C-alpha cells in the first residue's frame, strides 16, 4: 500500500514537503541573472515557446516598484497569487512611513510568510522560488533568494534549473573583479548562454537591465539584436 | 432640510402613449450654485429612466449600485428590466437600513419592455413604492408642482402638448419661485423612439 | 494477482525471497546482478544495502543534442531515401523522446512503399505526420510540467 | 482523521499535483472548443456532448454561456460546476462595474477567477475545478484577447487554444493557417466551418450540435452577434463549397 | 477489522463495540453499590487495599451532588469527578432559576442526555463509570435509578455494579429492608460484605458506606464510623 | 489535515469520473419510475407509488410536493434528503419573490438550486443528494420541463423518463410522443410509458398525474385519475 | 463492495449501498422489544411490552410508554438509550408548534419535522444514527385518529395500521386480512385484534401486567392509558 | 503505525518531537564558552559553495542589547522565535523600565517552548543557546526542541554536539581563564571543517559587561582566523 | 494491528494504552519522595543533568507560600499547568482574601485534565506533582498522574526505581509522624539513598529538599542548604 508521512517529517534526516519541493525548483523554467554597479542582467528560458502564441502572457518577470523587480521559477499558477499579494505588501508598504525600509523587509516578508506557509494547518508548502532584482539604495546592487524553507540568501551569481544554466554563472566568475567595464559585454553574456541554455532557439531569451536609479524597460529586438551579434565576435576574440 | 439642502426637483409626466420625466440641471450646495452640467437622470436599461431628487450622493450612490443589481437580474435571465422589477430593487435597497436609510426621492418612469403601454410610479426614501395613474412629481416645494399639474395634465395627451404643457410648467415657475433653476432637462420617450430636450431657464 | 498466489503480500514475500536469494547467504563469485525497471518503490531500505549500494543510474529525458546523436547514429546504418537532415526534425517536435522519432521514420518509408520503393507526398506526409503530431499534442499540457 | 483523508491538496511523491493530474483528464475529454485570431471581430464555437436531439434546447446558449451582455465565455465541463464560477466572475465583473463605471479589462478578469479555482487546491481539501472555459473582449490597450483557465489555478490564455479531444486533423493545420487575422467575418467562419465538418466524429458538421456566437467590435455598444442556426447553415455550405473548391486544385 | 474505532459508527453484529468495552470497564473497578428503604435510600463503597496503599478516607467514590441526591460512583474515578461537577453545575441551575429541590427523575435524565451524547460522537470518547443515583423526600419519597454507560435511564430497588462478587447483595432479600427504618439497616448490609469479595485475590479492604432519608430531613451525608458506631458493630460479629 | 470538518470527500478518478456521485445515479436507476412530458399548454407529469404492504394508503403521503402555486415537480430514485432541498427551495424562492416581486420561472428554480446541489456535493462529510429532480411550470406564457441530476447538471426534455429502465421509457416517449400534443393527450402517453415497468394492477394509488396549467400548477387528486385511468391509456 | 476505510466510517460505498445503516437493522435486536399499532374508526390502540428479569424492576420506571402531548401520545423500540434523546426533541417541536401555532399539533406532517431532526444525526460527519424507531398516534378535527411510526434513517412515515420491528414483520401479515376484505373497527375490536396480530407472531399470553396497552379514542381528546384495571378484562373479552 | 505523532507513541513520546532533532543533522553546529570575563561563542557557517555571502547567513542574533543568542538547524524556523523574541524584552522595559536579564527571557521562551498542536503548529527543531549577562555577571544558558530547559554553561550544538562538549567538559574547570578558552574552541573548530578557514567560514560571538556592543565587530573576525 | 491505530480504541482488555504510555514518562523522572508528619511536612526530590558542567535541573519549587510541590515528567505541560497554578492561587487570595485548600485545589487539576484525556487528537499531561499544602486540618500529601486521580496519603514515592523507597517507607512512614523537622529531613534523604545506585552519590547539589508547615512559609533549599541535612548521616552498607 502507500505508506508515508506530510508534516513533519521523517526520521531519515530529510523533510518530506520541503526538500521535494525543492524538485518542483529545480525542474523550473531555467533563468539566470547577474548584480554589478550599474546595470543588474537578468535571464530566462525553457518557455517552450511554439512561436503561435503571445509572448506576454508568459512574460516570467514582474515589477513591485521600478526599483525592485520580481524574478521566479516555478509554476504559474501560484505567481499571481504572490503577485496579488506581494504587491499589496509593497502598497501598504508605500502607503504609511514613505520612505521604505532598504531591502530586509520585503525580502524577510515572502521568506517569513513562506515558513509559516508551511507552519499552520491547512496550509500547503508552495513547490516554486524566487530571486529579488533590482538595484539598493546609493548606487549599490541587492539580490536574493526565497528557498522553500524560508532563508533568505544572497547570491553573487544566479544558477538554477537545468546544468546548462549553471554554465551562465560559471561564465560570470571567469570575468574576475575588474570585468565587465563597459555594458556591452555584460548584455553579451546572455546572448552567449542563449546557445548554452536550454534549446538554443533564440526566441524563449529574454533580459531587462536596470543602470543605476533609472527603471529597467523590457529589451526591444534591436539593442538585444546588437550586442547577440557581438557576443559570436567577443567569443572568437578568444580564438 | 435635507431634500432642499442640493434642491432639485423630479417632475414625471404619462402621457397617452408614452411618457415623459423631467429633472433640472442645477447643482450646488444650499443657496450656492456649482456647475449646471451635473446629471441626474440615469439611463437604465433600455427605453427606461430614473429620475432622483436629494442629496447628490444618494443619487450617485443608489444609481451605481442599482446598476449592480440590474444587470445581475438580466444575466442570469435574458428577459427584461421590466419597471416592476427594477421598482422593487430600489425598494430593497433602500431598506438596507431601516433606521439609517438613504435620503433621496427616486421617480421610475419607463416603458413596459412587453408593450408600448408606459407605467410611472415613485418611492419614499425609506423604500415605500407608490404609484400614480396621472403623474410623479417630487422636489422642494410642493405647491407649484401639485397646483399647476392638476389644472394642467389631460388623460389623453399626445407627445406635441405633453412636452409642451410641462415646458411652460416649468418656464412660470423657475422664472417665479427661487429653490430651482439653472436649466431643466426633459426625457420624453416613445415606442418609436427616444426624445431628449433641454428647456430653457434663467442663468441667475 | 496471478491464479492463486496471495495476493497482497505473498507477491511481497516471493520478492522477500529475491531478497534473500540475492542477499545472499552464501554466495561469492558473480553471477553480477543487474536490476532493472520502470519504477522502483519496491526495494525495501534493507535490500539496497548489499545492492545496489554503491552505482544504480538515472537517465534524464534527452535534450537537443542527445536527441540529434540518438537518431543521426540509429541511421548510421540505414537511412531512408538518404537526404535525411536533422535540423528540422528536432525544430518541428518539441518535445518528445527519441522513442518515437524512429516509429514516425518507420512509417515514412513505409508509406512511401504504397511507391515500392521512394517518393514523398507533400499533402500526404504531413498529413500522416499529423497522426503522431496530435498524439503528442493531445497531452501536451500538464502542467506546465516545472 | 489522518487515515481517512486521501491528501488531495497535498502533492504527488513524483512531483505532480495528484489531484490536478487526474482532473485534466476529463478536460481532455468532454468540452470541445476552439479559438483563433481575427480582426475586427472574435469567433467562438463548440460541440455539445448533450447534442443527442431529444433535447429542448430551450437554453438558447448553453456551452457558449454569455457572462455579460459584451462579453461571453465558452466552457468545457461540467455545467452546475461551472455556474458556480460563472456567477461568481459575473459578480467580480460586475463588482468592477460598480466602483469603476468601465468594462472589466480581459487580463485581471482571469487572473480573478483562476486564484478562485486555486484556493480549492492549496488549502481546505476541496474538490477542484475541473472546468476550463475561454475568455474573449476587448479593451482600450491591447485590445482583443484570447484567455484560457486552467485547474491547476493558473491562466492558461494564448493566442490559440486545442479543446478538448477531437479537432486533431485542424489542430495542426492551424499552424499553417496562423496567418494572422482578416474579416469578411464570414471567411473567419468559413475556416471554422472546415474544423468543425472535417474533425466531428459523426462529421457531417451537424448544425443543431454546434453553436457559433461571434463578438463584433462596436463603438461603444460592442454587438455581440449570436447566430440563429438559420444563418449557421448557409454559413456551413458556404465553405463546403469552398472546401470542394479547394479539392479542385489537386 | 477496525470497526472499534470510530464511535460513530457501528458494528458488524449491529451494536457499538466503545459500549461494549466500556460495559467491562466499570467491571474491573471496585464494588460500589446502592440499595433503597422506605424512607431513605443507601449507598455503599468498598476500598481496595494492596500494599498501604494511602491514608484512610481518601479520594472516596462517595461524593455529594445535591441535598437530597448523592452519588455512588464506580470505574475510572477522574471521570466520575467530571461528571460530579457537571451534576454539581446542573443541580445549580434548578437552585437558581427555580430554588427548591431537583427531582431525581429529571436530574437522571440530565446526566442520561449527556453520557449518551459523548457516546455518539467519535470525537469525544464514552464514559466508563456506572453509578448510582437515589433520593428521599417529604414530597417525593425514595427512589433509586441505575444508570449504564450506554445511555439507557431507569432504576430499581437495588442494583451492583464494581467487583463481580455479586453475593453482598444475596442476603438483603433475606432481611427486612421496605419494613425496616433504615437505621439498622445500615448495619445489616455489611455483614455479607466482609465474608464474599475473599482474601485471596485482595489481602486488605475498606468498606464506605452513605445514606439519605427520613432520618437526615433529606440531607446527605456519610455516615459517621464513631457515630451511631453500629455500623461495623454488627458487621464483625455476622460474619458467621 | 485541518479541522476536521467535513472537508470534501470527492476525488477524481484516474479518468477524472466522479466517484460517490456517480453512485448517487445507481439509487435513481434502483429507484421508482417517474416520468413528465412538456407539451403545447402545459407539463404533465406522471409518477408512480405502489404500497410494499396493503396496510399503507397513499392518500397521505404525496409524491408530488409542489414548490410554489404555479410550479409542480416530481423527484426519483430516493425522501430523507429530498424533504431538505425542498423546504430550502422554499425559503430560496423567496428572495426572488420578495425582491423582483414576481412568480419566479421554473429556469431560476433551476440556476439556484443546482448551484446549491453542486456546492452541497462539493462539500464533503455528507452523502449527495440521490435525488433527480423533474422541475416544471409556467413562466412568461411558456412552460418549461427541466431534469436536474444528482451531479447537478440540467437539461431540457420534451418527454423524459427516470427511474427504472429509464432508458427503454425514454425510446418510447420519444416515439409516442413527438412535436406537442394536449394536456389530455400528454396524459395518456404519460401512463402508457409509467404502465410499462408497472405491475398488472393500476388503480387509483398505483399511479398520481400531476399537470401544470397555464393556470399554474393544479395538483389532480386520485379521483381523476381513476377516472381517466382504469382502463389506463 | 468495499474499498479502503470506509468501512470505519458512515459513508456511501463503492457500489453506492451502505454499511452503517444497514448495521442499524439488528440495532434493535439487543432490546428484543415489539410495538404493533392498530387504528380504528374514531380509535387507535398500541400495543407494547417489558421484560422483567428480575423482581426489582418498578413498573412506573422501567416503562416504555412515552406521552409527547396531553392529546398525542407516543412509543419506542430497540434500544432505550437512543430513544429518550429523541423523547426530549419530540417534545421540543410539539412546544414550539403550541406556543407558536396553537392548535392540535401538525397531526401528518409532524413526522417529517422530527425525521429531519432524525435526518441530522444521520447526515453529521461522524455521529451515532440513533436506530431507536419513533412511533406516533394523533388527534385530529372530524379526521379521525391517527397513527404514525417513523424509522431512523430520515423519512416520515405512517398509515392506518403499521408494524416494523424485530418480529413485527409477521404482525402485519396477519393485519393485511385482517382489516381487509371490508370491515370497520370499533373500541375493543382494535383492543382484541392488538393480541391478535401479535398471537401469529409469539403471544406467550401471560399475566397482562407486563405488557402494556396503549389506546386513544376521540371522546375526551386528551391521550391517557389506564392502569392494570380493565386491560385485563379486554384480554379475557377477546377469550370467549 | 503513525497515529497522530502527538498521541505518545507505545514507547512512548511524540513523534515529531522525537522527528525535529534529527533535523539538527541538516544543519551546521556552533560552540558555547562561559568564563567569569565574559562569554564567547563561535560556530561556522557551512559553506557549500563560494557563491555564498557571509553576512547574508548569521547564527548569531542578539536578542536584546546586552543579551545574545545562537541557532541551531534551519534558519527561518529560529527567525519567527528570535524576532518575537525581541518584542518581548522590550515590553518588559516598558512596563518595569528595566529589562529582561538572562533569566525573564528564558521563562518567556520556556512558556512558549512548546506551542504545537494538531486540534486548537508544527514544533521547531531549532536548539538555541542563550548568552547575555545579567545581574550575576556574564551568563550562557541552552535549550531544546523538546522544549526542557536546562542551564548549560558552555553548550554546544549541531551534529558535533556529541563530539564537541565531550571533550569541551574537561576543560570547564574554573581555573581556566577566558583566554585559554578562547585558543581551545578553534582547536575543535579546525577539526569540525573540511574547508581551511576564511574570513567567510566562521564568526564569533563575544558579549562582556564593559565592552559592548559587541555583539561583535568586522575584521576582528579575521585575526583569530590566521591564528589557526 | 487495524483496530490499534487511533486513541478512541479501548483495547480488549478494557484500558486505553494511551495513559499507560504517558505513565512511562512520570516513571523516567527522578526519583522523588513526598512525605508528611501529623505537625510538618517534608518533600525530597531529585536533580538530574545531561552533561557535567549543565547546572543540575530543579524539581522542588514554590508556588503557594503553605504550598510546595515537585514535578517530575513532561516539563512543557508541566510549566502550562504551572502558569495556570499560580492562577488559582493568586484567584482567592484576591476575590476571597485566602489560600486554596489543597484538598478542593487539585480537584480542579484533575479536571482540568480530563478534556485532553477525551477528545480525539488531544494528548494527556504527563505529570510528577507532589503536592504538600496546609489547610485548617493540616499537611496534605497528594499524587499526579496522567489518567488524573489524585491520592491523599502521608507519603508517595514516584520517578526511577522510586518503589524501593515505598519499601523504606511502609514501616517507617506510619513511624515519621511524631519527628521533628530536624531528624525528618535526614530520615527522609535516607529514604532517596538506595533510590540512586549505591555506588556513588548522592551528592549535595545533585538532590531537591523543601520543607513546609502551619507556620512555616515554604523555602526552596539546594545546593549548599542540603549540607545541614547531609551531616551526621551513616553510610549505606555493603
Not at chain 2, 449592480?68 to 437580474?73: I, P
Not at chain 5, 461494549?20 to 424512607?39: H, P, Q
Not at chain 5, 460522537?121 to 449504564?148: E, H, K, T, W
Not at chain 8, 513520546?13 to 564558552?33: C, D, M, N, P
Request: glycine residues 6%.
Amino acid at each position: 500500500s502507500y505508506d508515508r508521512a506530510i508534516t513533519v517529517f521523517s526520521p531519515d534526516g530529510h523533510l518530506f514537503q520541503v526538500e521535494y519541493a525543492q524538485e518542483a525548483v529545480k525542474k523550473g523554467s531555467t533563468a539566470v541573472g547577474v548584480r554589478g554597479r550599474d546595470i543588474v542582467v537578468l535571464g530566462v528560458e525553457k518557455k517552450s515557446v511554439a512561436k503561435l502564441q503571445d509572448e506576454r502572457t508568459v512574460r516570467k518577470i514582474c515589477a513591485l516598484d521600478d526599483n525592485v523587480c520580481m524574478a521566479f521559477a516555478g509554476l504559474t499558477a501560484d505567481a499571481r497569487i504572490v503577485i496579488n499579494r506581494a504587491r499589496v505588501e509593497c502598497q501598504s508598504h508605500r502607503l504609511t512611513v514613505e520612505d521604505p525600509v532598504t531591502v530586509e523587509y520585503i525580502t524577510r516578508y515572502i521568506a517569513s510568510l513562506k515558513q509559516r506557509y508551511t507552519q499552520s494547518n491547512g496550509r500547503r508548502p508552495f513547490g516554486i522560488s524566487a530571486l529579488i532584482v533590482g538595484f539598493d539604495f546609493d548606487g549599490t546592487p541587492r539580490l536574493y533568494q526565497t528557498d522553500p524553507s524560508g532563508t533568505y540568501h544572497a547570491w553573487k551569481a544566479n544558477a538554477i534549473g537545468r546544468g546548462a544554466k549553471s554554465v551562465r554563472e560559471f561564465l560570470e566568475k571567469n570575468y574576475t573583479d575588474e570585468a565587465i567595464e563597459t555594458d556591452d559585454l555584460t548584455i553579451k553574456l546572455v546572448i552567449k548562454a542563449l546557445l548554452e541554455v536550454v534549446q538554443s532557439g533564440g526566441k524563449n531569451i529574454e533580459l531587462a537591465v536596470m543602470r543605476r536609479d533609472q527603471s529597467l524597460k523590457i529589451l526591444n529586438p534591436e539593442e538585444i539584436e546588437k550586442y547577440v551579434a557581438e557576443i559570436e565576435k567577443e567569443k572568437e576574440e578568444n580564438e | 432640510s435635507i431634500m432642499s439642502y442640493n434642491g432639485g426637483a423630479v417632475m414625471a409626466m404619462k402621457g397617452k402613449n408614452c411618457v415623459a420625466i423631467a429633472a433640472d440641471r442645477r447643482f450646488g450646495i444650499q443657496a450656492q450654485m456649482v456647475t449646471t452640467d451635473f446629471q441626474k437622470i440615469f439611463p437604465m436599461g433600455d427605453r427606461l429612466y430614473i429620475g432622483l431628487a436629494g442629496l447628490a450622493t444618494d443619487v450617485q450612490t443608489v444609481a451605481q449600485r442599482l446598476k449592480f443589481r440590474l444587470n445581475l437580474y438580466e444575466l442570469k435571465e435574458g428577459r427584461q428590466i421590466k419597471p416592476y422589477t427594477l421598482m422593487s430593487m430600489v425598494a430593497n435597497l433602500l431598506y438596507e437600513k431601516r433606521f439609517g436609510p438613504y435620503y433621496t426621492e427616486p421617480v421610475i418612469a419607463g416603458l413596459d419592455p412587453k408593450t408600448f403601454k408606459p407605467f410611472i410610479c415613485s418611492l419614499d426614501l425609506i423604500g415605500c413604492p407608490m404609484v400614480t395613474d396621472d403623474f410623479v412629481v417630487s422636489g422642494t416645494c410642493a405647491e407649484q408642482m401639485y397646483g399647476m399639474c392638476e389644472s394642467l395634465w389631460e388623460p389623453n395627451m399626445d407627445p406635441d402638448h405633453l412636452f409642451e404643457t410641462i415646458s411652460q410648467a416649468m418656464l412660470n415657475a423657475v422664472d417665479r419661485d427661487a429653490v430651482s433653476g439653472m436649466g431643466v432637462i426633459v426625457h420624453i420617450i416613445e415606442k418609436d423612439k427616444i426624445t431628449t430636450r433641454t428647456l430653457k431657464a434663467r442663468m441667475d | 494477482y496471478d491464479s492463486n498466489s496471495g495476493g497482497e503480500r505473498e507477491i511481497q514475500r516471493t520478492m522477500l525471497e529475491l531478497l534473500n536469494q540475492l542477499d545472499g547467504f552464501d554466495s561469492r563469485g558473480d553471477v553480477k546482478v543487474i536490476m532493472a525497471t520502470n519504477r522502483i518503490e519496491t526495494l525495501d531500505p534493507a535490500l539496497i544495502r548489499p545492492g545496489r549500494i554503491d552505482r544504480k543510474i538515472e537517465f534524464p529525458l534527452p535534450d537537443e543534442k542527445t536527441k540529434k546523436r540518438i537518431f543521426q547514429i540509429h541511421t548510421s546504418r540505414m537511412t531512408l531515401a538518404d537526404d535525411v537532415t536533422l535540423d528540422d526534425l528536432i525544430m518541428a517536435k518539441d518535445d518528445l523522446s527519441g522513442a518515437d522519432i524512429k516509429a514516425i521514420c518507420t512509417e515514412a518509408g513505409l508509406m512511401a512503399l504504397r511507391e515500392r520503393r521512394m517518393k514523398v507526398t507533400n499533402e500526404d506526409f504531413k498529413k500522416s505526420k499529423e497522426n503522431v503530431l496530435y498524439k503528442k499534442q493531445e497531452g501536451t499540457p500538464e502542467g506546465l510540467y516545472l | 482523521s489522518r487515515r481517512y483523508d486521501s491528501r488531495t491538496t497535498i502533492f504527488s511523491p513524483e512531483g505532480r499535483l495528484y489531484q490536478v493530474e487526474y482532473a485534466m483528464e476529463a478536460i481532455g475529454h468532454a468540452g470541445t472548443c476552439l479559438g483563433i485570431l481575427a480582426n475586427d471581430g472574435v469567433l467562438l464555437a463548440a460541440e455539445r456532448r448533450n447534442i443527442h436531439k431529444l433535447l429542448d434546447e430551450v437554453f438558447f446558449s448553453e456551452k457558449i454561456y454569455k457572462l455579460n451582455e459584451d462579453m461571453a465565455c465558452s466552457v468545457a465541463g461540467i455545467t452546475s460546476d461551472a455556474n458556480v464560477l460563472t456567477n461568481e466572475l459575473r459578480l467580480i465583473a460586475q463588482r468592477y462595474l460598480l466602483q469603476y463605471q468601465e468594462p472589466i479589462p480581459c487580463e485581471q478578469l482571469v487572473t480573478a477567477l483562476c486564484d478562485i479555482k486555486q484556493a480549492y487546491t492549496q488549502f481546505g481539501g476541496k474538490r477542484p475545478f475541473g472546468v476550463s472555459l475561454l475568455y474573449i473582449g476587448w479593451d482600450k490597450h491591447y485590445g482583443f484577447q484570447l484567455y484560457q483557465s486552467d485547474p491547476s489555478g493558473n491562466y492558461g490564455g494564448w493566442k490559440a487554444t486545442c479543446i478538448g479531444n477531437n479537432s486533431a486533423a485542424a489542430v495542426s493545420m492551424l499552424k499553417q493557417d496562423y496567418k494572422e487575422g482578416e474579416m469578411t467575418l464570414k471567411s473567419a467562419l468559413a475556416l471554422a466551418i472546415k474544423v468543425l465538418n472535417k474533425t466531428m466524429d459523426v462529421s457531417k458538421l451537424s448544425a443543431e450540435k454546434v453553436e457559433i456566437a461571434t463578438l463584433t467590435r462596436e463603438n461603444g455598444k460592442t454587438v455581440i452577434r449570436v447566430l440563429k442556426q438559420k444563418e449557421v447553415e448557409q454559413l456551413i455550405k458556404k465553405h463546403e463549397e469552398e472546401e470542394a473548391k479547394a479539392e479542385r486544385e489537386k | 477489522t477496525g470497526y472499534d474505532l470510530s464511535a460513530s459508527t457501528f458494528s458488524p453484529d449491529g451494536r457499538v463495540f466503545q459500549v461494549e468495552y466500556a460495559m467491562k470497564a466499570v467491571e474491573n473497578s471496585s464494588t460500589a453499590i446502592g440499595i433503597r428503604c422506605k424512607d431513605g435510600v443507601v449507598f455503599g463503597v468498598e476500598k481496595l487495599v494492596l500494599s498501604k496503599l494511602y491514608e484512610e478516607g481518601s479520594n472516596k467514590r462517595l461524593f455529594n451532588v445535591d441535598r437530597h441526591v448523592g452519588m455512588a460512583v464506580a470505574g475510572l474515578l477522574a471521570d466520575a469527578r467530571s461528571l460530579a461537577d457537571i451534576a454539581r453545575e446542573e443541580a445549580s441551575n434548578f437552585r437558581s432559576n427555580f430554588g427548591y429541590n431537583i427531582p431525581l427523575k429529571h436530574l437522571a435524565d440530565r446526566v442520561a442526555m449527556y453520557v449518551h451524547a459523548y457516546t455518539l460522537y467519535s470525537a469525544v470518547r464514552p464514559f466508563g463509570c456506572s453509578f448510582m443515583l437515589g433520593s428521599y423526600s417529604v414530597n417525593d419519597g425514595a427512589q433509586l435509578y441505575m444508570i449504564d454507560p450506554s445511555g439507557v435511564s431507569y432504576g430499581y430497588w437495588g442494583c451492583a455494579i464494581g467487583k463481580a462478587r455479586q453475593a453482598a447483595k444475596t442476603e438483603i432479600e433475606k432481611l427486612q429492608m421496605k419494613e425496616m427504618t433504615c437505621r439498622d439497616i445500615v448495619k445489616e448490609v455489611a455483614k455479607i460484605i466482609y465474608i464474599v469479595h475473599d482474601e485471596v485475590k485482595d489481602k486488605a479492604f475498606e468498606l464506605e458506606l452513605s445514606w439519605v432519608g427520613e432520618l437526615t430531613n433529606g440531607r446527605h451525608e456519610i455516615v459517621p464510623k464513631d457515630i451511631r458506631e453500629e455500623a461495623e458493630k454488627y458487621a464483625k460479629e455476622s460474619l458467621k | 489535515a485541518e479541522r476536521g470538518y467535513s472537508f470534501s470527500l470527492t476525488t477524481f478518478s484516474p479518468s477524472g469520473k466522479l466517484v460517490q456521485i456517480e453512485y448517487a445515479l445507481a439509487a435513481v436507476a434502483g429507484g421508482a419510475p417517474s416520468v413528465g412530458i412538456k407539451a403545447a399548454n402545459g407539463v404533465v407529469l406522471a409518477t408512480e407509488k405502489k404500497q410494499k404492504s396493503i396496510l399503507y394508503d397513499e392518500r397521505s403521503v404525496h409524491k408530488v410536493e409542489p414548490i410554489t402555486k404555479h410550479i409542480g415537480l416530481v423527484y426519483s430514485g430516493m425522501g430523507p434528503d429530498y424533504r431538505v432541498l425542498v423546504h430550502r427551495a422554499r425559503k430560496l424562492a423567496q428572495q426572488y419573490y420578495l425582491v423582483y416581486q414576481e412568480p419566479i420561472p421554473t429556469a431560476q428554480l433551476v440556476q439556484r438550486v443546482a448551484s446549491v446541489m453542486q456546492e452541497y456535493t462539493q462539500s464533503g462529510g455528507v452523502r449527495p443528494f440521490g435525488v433527480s429532480l423533474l422541475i416544471c411550470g409556467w413562466n412568461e406564457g411558456r412552460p418549461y420541463l427541466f431534469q436536474s441530476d444528482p451531479s447537478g447538471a440540467y437539461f431540457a426534455w420534451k418527454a423524459t423518463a427516470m427511474g427504472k429502465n429509464y432508458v427503454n421509457g425514454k425510446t418510447f416517449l420519444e416515439k409516442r410522443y413527438n412535436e406537442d400534443l394536449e394536456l389530455e393527450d400528454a396524459i395518456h402517453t404519460a401512463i402508457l410509458t409509467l404502465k410499462e415497468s408497472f405491475e398488472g394492477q393500476m388503480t387509483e394509488d398505483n399511479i398520481e398525474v400531476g399537470i401544470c396549467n397555464e393556470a399554474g400548477f393544479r395538483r389532480l387528486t386520485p379521483t381523476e385519475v381513476k377516472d381517466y385511468l382504469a382502463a389506463i391509456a | 463492495s468495499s474499498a479502503g476505510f470506509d468501512r470505519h466510517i458512515t459513508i456511501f460505498s463503492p457500489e453506492g449501498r451502505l454499511y452503517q445503516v444497514e448495521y442499524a437493522f439488528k440495532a434493535i435486536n439487543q432490546g428484543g422489544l415489539t410495538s404493533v399499532a392498530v387504528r380504528g374508526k374514531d380509535c387507535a390502540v398500541i400495543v407494547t411490552q417489558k421484560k422483567v428479569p428480575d423482581k426489582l424492576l418498578d413498573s412506573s420506571t422501567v416503562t416504555h410508554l412515552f406521552k409527547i402531548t396531553e392529546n398525542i401520545g407516543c412509543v419506542m423500540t430497540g434500544m432505550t438509550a437512543d430513544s429518550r434523546s429523541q423523547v426530549q426533541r419530540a417534545r421540543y417541536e410539539a412546544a414550539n408548534w403550541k406556543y407558536k401555532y396553537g392548535y392540535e399539533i401538525p397531526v401528518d406532517m409532524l413526522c417529517k419535522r422530527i425525521a429531519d431532526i432524525s435526518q441530522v444525526y444521520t447526515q453529521n460527519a461522524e455521529m451515532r444514527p440513533l436506530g431507536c424507531c419513533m412511533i406516533l398516534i394523533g388527534i385530529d378535527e372530524e379526521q379521525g385518529p391517527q397513527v404514525y411510526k417513523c424509522d431512523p434513517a430520515g423519512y416520515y412515515c405512517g398509515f392506518k395500521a403499521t408494524a416494523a420491528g424485530v418480529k413485527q414483520t409477521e404482525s402485519t401479515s396477519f393485519l393485511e386480512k385482517k382489516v381487509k376484505k371490508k370491515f370497520d373497527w370499533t373500541f375493543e375490536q382494535t383492543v382484541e385484534t392488538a393480541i391478535t396480530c401479535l398471537s401469529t407472531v409469539l403471544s406467550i399470553d401471560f399475566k397482562p401486567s407486563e405488557i402494556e396497552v396503549g389506546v386513544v379514542t376521540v371522546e375526551n381528546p386528551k391521550f391517557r392509558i389506564l392502569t392494570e384495571a380493565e386491560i385485563d378484562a379486554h384480554l379475557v373479552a377477546l377469550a370467549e | 503505525y503513525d497515529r497522530g505523532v502527538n498521541t505518545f507513541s507505545p514507547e512512548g513520546r511524540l513523534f515529531q518531537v522525537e522527528y525535529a532533532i534529527e533535523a539538527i543533522k541538516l544543519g551546521s553546529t556552533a560552540i558555547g564558552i562561559q568564563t567569569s570575563e565574559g562569554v564567547c561563542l563561535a560556530v561556522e557557517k557551512r559553506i557549500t559553495s563560494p557563491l555564498m555571502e557571509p553576512s547574508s547567513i548569521e547564527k548569531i542574533v542578539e536578542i536584546d542589547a546586552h543579551i545574545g543568542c545562537a541557532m541551531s538547524g534551519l534558519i527561518a524556523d529560529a527567525k519567527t522565535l528570535i524576532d518575537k523574541a525581541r518584542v518581548e524584552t522590550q515590553n518588559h522595559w516598558f512596563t518595569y523600565n528595566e529589562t529582561m536579564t538572562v533569566e525573564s527571557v528564558t521563562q518567556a521562551v520556556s512558556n512558549l517552548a512548546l506551542q504545537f498542536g494538531e486540534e486548537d503548529s508544527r514544533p521547531f527543531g531549532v536548539a538555541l543557546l542563550f548568552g547575555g549577562v545579567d545581574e550575576k555577571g556574564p551568563q550562557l544558558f541552552h535549550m531544546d526542541p523538546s522544549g526542557t530547559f536546562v542551564q548549560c554553561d558552555a553548550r554546544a550544538i549541531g551534529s558535533a554536539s556529541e563530539g564537541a562538549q565531550s571533550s569541551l567538559q574537561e576543560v570547564y574547570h574554573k581555573s581556566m581563564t577566558l583566554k585559554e578558552a578562547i585558543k581551545s574552541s578553534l582547536i575543535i573548530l579546525k577539526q569540525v571543517m573540511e574547508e581551511k578557514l576564511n574570513a567567510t567560514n566562521i564568526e564569533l560571538a563575544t558579549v562582556q559587561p564593559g565592552q559592548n556592543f559587541h555583539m561583535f565587530t568586522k575584521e576582528e573576525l579575521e585575526e583569530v582566523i590566521k591564528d589557526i | 494491528n487495524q483496530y490499534d491505530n487511533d486513541v478512541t480504541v479501548w483495547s480488549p482488555q478494557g484500558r486505553i494504552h494511551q495513559i499507560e504510555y504517558a505513565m512511562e514518562a512520570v516513571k523516567q523522572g527522578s526519583a522523588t519522595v513526598g512525605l508528611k508528619s501529623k505537625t510538618h511536612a517534608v518533600l525530597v526530590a531529585l536533580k538530574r543533568a545531561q552533561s557535567e558542567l549543565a547546572a543540575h535541573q530543579k524539581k522542588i519549587l514554590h508556588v503557594d507560600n503553605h504550598i510546595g510541590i515537585s514535578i517530575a515528567g513532561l516539563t512543557a505541560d508541566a510549566r502550562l499547568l504551572c502558569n495556570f497554578m499560580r492562577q488559582e492561587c493568586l484567584d482567592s487570595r484576591f476575590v476571597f482574601d485566602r489560600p486554596l485548600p489543597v484538598s478542593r485545589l487539585v480537584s480542579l487539576i484533575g479536571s482540568k485534565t480530563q478534556i485532553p484525556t477525551q477528545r480525539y487528537g488531544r494528548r494527556p499531561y504527563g505529570v510528577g506533582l507532589l503536592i504538600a499544602g496546609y489547610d485548617d486540618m493540616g499537611p496534605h500529601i497528594f499524587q499526579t498522574c496522567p489518567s488524573a486521580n489524585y491520592f491523599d496519603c502521608r507519603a508517595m514515592s514516584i520517578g526511577a526505581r522510586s518503589q524501593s523507597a515505598r519499601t523504606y517507607l511502609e514501616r517507617h512512614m506510619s513511624e515519621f509522624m511524631e519527628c521533628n523537622l530536624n531528624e525528618l529531613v535526614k530520615h527522609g534523604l535516607r529514604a532517596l539513598r538506595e533510590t540512586l545506585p549505591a555506588e556513588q552519590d548522592l551528592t549535595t547539589k545533585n538532590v531537591s529538599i523543601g520543607i513546609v508547615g502551619k507556620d512555616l512559609e515554604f523555602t526552596i533549599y539546594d545546593d549548599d542548604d542540603v549540607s545541614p541535612f547531609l551531616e551526621g548521616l551513616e553510610e549505606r552498607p555493603q
